[PDB]
């Protein structure tokens, strides 16, 4: 409730005609920080980044200000994608905003990519040094979790992007497996282009008392 976006965001949102936005609401529309799980039907890139990515980045920045003496590897937030290409571009966007918000007087948030087809070079440089946000595909993530190579203990925010596509592609078992590695409570956002029965049921499994934003 006391959270504010810094001036680069507030400036750029104002150019678009968005006045008085906060990390908990965008012109009265809730984000993932307002205490509810969410189902987001037919969102574009830009809508997803207002309701999920920017508000979670702010959460990361606030947590960084008073850390415990003995630190934990994050991430604080996780985005699960259907594909390598989509994970990489989603990961490039997060890095873009992470760079934008450092230059508003701070140190740099680090985003991990967790997908197949990463060289060992790419695998080391992402995971070791710090991880605040992670972007992954379901198979690779599951395998990292089971091999105890990644931890979800402080991960509060989860987005499932294109869950319809993920389920179509046969990743549902893999996502449920990932659900079982959350020890604490998560706030979960589900994105989908459409909402047939198949996904309605997966959402019942995956979410608790969700708010629904449907722009189809």
Author numbering: 184 to 399
Quote what the paper states about this structure:
We determined the apo-form structures of two constructs, residues 169–402 (DEAD402) and 169–399 (DEAD399), at 1.5 and 2.2 Å resolutions, respectively. In contrast to DEAD402, the crystal structure of DEAD399 contains four molecules in the asymmetric unit, and their N-terminal regions adopt two different conformations. In one conformation, the Q motif is located away from α3 and motif I. Helix α2 is rearranged to form two β strands (β1′ and β2′), and residues 169–183 are disordered. We hereafter refer to this conformation of the N-terminal region as the “open form 1”. In the other conformation, helix α3 and motif I adopt similar conformations to those in open form 1, while residues 169–209, including the entire Q motif, are disordered. We hereafter refer to this conformation of the N-terminal region as the “open form 2”. In these models, the Q motif, including Ile201 and Gln208, is distant from the modeled ATP in the open form 1, while it is disordered in the open form 2. Moreover, in both open forms 1 and 2, motif I forms part of the extended α3 helix, which sterically clashes with the modeled ATP. Consequently, the structure of the ATP-binding site is completely rearranged in these open forms, and thus they do not seem to be able to bind ATP. Therefore, these results suggested that the closed form represents the ATP-bound state of DDX41, while both open forms 1 and 2 represent its nucleotide-free state.
In contrast, DEAD box protein 41 (DDX41), a member of the helicase superfamily 2 (SF2), is unique in that it can recognize two different types of ligands, double-stranded DNA (dsDNA) and CDN45. DDX41 consists of two RecA-like domains (i.e., DEAD and HELICc domains), which are conserved among DEAD box proteins. These domains have several conserved motifs, such as the Q motif and motif I, which are both essential for ATP binding by the DEAD box proteins. In this work, we determined two different crystal structures of the DDX41 DEAD domain in apo forms.
